[model samples]
Target: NVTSIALRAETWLLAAWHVKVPPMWLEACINWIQEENNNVNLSQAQMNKQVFEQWLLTDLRDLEHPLLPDGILEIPKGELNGFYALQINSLVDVSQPAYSQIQKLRGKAQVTPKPWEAKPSRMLMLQLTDGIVQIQGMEYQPIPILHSDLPPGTKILIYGNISFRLGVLLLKPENVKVLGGEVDALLEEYAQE
Candidate 1:
């Protein structure tokens, strides 16, 4: 049954969030589903799993407990040289000359042209939880997914040798791991429209 599948999926989702569904919360979910079906019996109600999952996520966001646990931004002392979870505040591609000039005018280092390459290497105006930094390397070239469609506020685990030069923070990527989570309903609706 669709309802059974939805409930099962909800259980798994809640488990991942370290939540045990309150009895009242389950009741509320049932009532919401019934209302969505115009008060029809749930056994005969139509269900879309994706929509139901989104509803659950939206509901969870309103609770006192956050969907992501706290201290994600806290970096352990030794781990400063290793990967740690960080939220991306924004992304900027410096591959374009126009954008590179903008960074240059702002006193950031400009991307150097490679002698053997026709195109300049990709550079990111990477804003992380701790600070803003610039990243440029061959490691990210094969994975265009990380460069494109990486929304702001997405969490990632990254490790690199960090350096500061000429008032700019630079990092050559050693590793990058994407840890995606829920998108806000406001953003979701805006995208749909």
Candidate 2:
């Protein structure tokens, strides 16, 4: 399994998930691949995740959402695997958390602007369900994001800092009675636990 491409998505997915980070950019490429190559061997779950990731990334880029200066690999050293006691220094080049761990991080409040702050100004809560978000752009570099606490099917507000002295906001969990795609990802409930 280690030598398989089958593990690539899982590898990427899990890391982003556990880190509670979004894989939108990566999804952008994967979605392009999936749309063209139906011959590729992948399960339905894998395809769903791949496509979802693409949409999320598109939304983020669309909004010019801010993330890490580099990307997911920046989770503090000795941070991701702190409890496991695994010397993942070898994984320095390998960004992302373990697959299972990432799955757990998805759909939860993750991604803090500053390490010292617990009630983060921003987070990636909707996971693949919605667009990639960057709140407080120029007001704050790598803008802070706040995942709505609203329940699925319940629309809420999403805000981002587009420029200095100005932040963008999106009223979501909308009924969607309006027409233009102002809302990117519709909120949906996770699979029953």
Candidate 3:
């Protein structure tokens, strides 16, 4: 036989199971398969139904997880291989261990405010399933960002500086966007004047 990969919803009803796939990787796989279409074949399990059921219940019980209603599972930036990433789209509880990594880094990570004569700060709101994050340590008094008012997909630059002391990431409200048009020209004219 021939086993052709296909997109089927609720395919489990027909003894088929589903696995979420990232679109970029899926597209790559589809392209690869099309190039070698004649040689493509999905392998079948050697175990019987009972053995498969036993394994599924025991080994794969933790694989099922709740996902956000409109959340996307997009691929991460740059080249990634054999991994899955979820887009944050739900309310996250503080008690949850989801953000423990950042919490753990709080005391140990010493952030310094960048020199005004140097690197600049713009901003981006990184939305998580449970919360949103704004790293504001590097921005000068020229650009202010109101998280609630930002339009969707508004491009913003992020500065990754780690030299500032504690309490340096405080939000600045004095910076204002005078006009909205060509980003480069506006920023340049504002910076120049």
- Each prediction's Cα RMSD? 9.7, 19.5, 19.9
TM-score of model 2 vs. true structure: 0.20
TM-score of 3: 0.18
> Model 2: how far is 15 from its true place, Å?
2.5
Off by over 4 Å in 3: 1-4, 7-28, 34-38, 42-67, 70-193
Candidate with best TM-score: 1
What C-alpha lDDT do the candidate models reach, one value each?
0.46, 0.30, 0.28
Stretches of candidate 1 exceeding 4 Å from the true structure: 1-9, 12-27, 43-51, 56-60, 76-99, 102-114, 117-185, 188-193
Q: Write the per-residue lDDT of candidate 3 for residues 48-164, one digit (tens) a residue.
A: 222223222221112233222221233121221221112211111222253456557855789999655422233432332101222223232324343334322222222222122
lDDT of 1 by residue, 55-139 (tens): 4344232332332223333422212244344445455665676656866896757998756735456666655542233222223
Question: Candidate 2: worst 10 consecutive residues by lDDT?
Answer: 83-92
- lDDT, residue 169, candidate 1: 36
Clashing pairs counted in every model: 0, 12, 8
Best by lDDT: 1
Instruction: Return the lDDT, model 1, position 75.
Output: 26
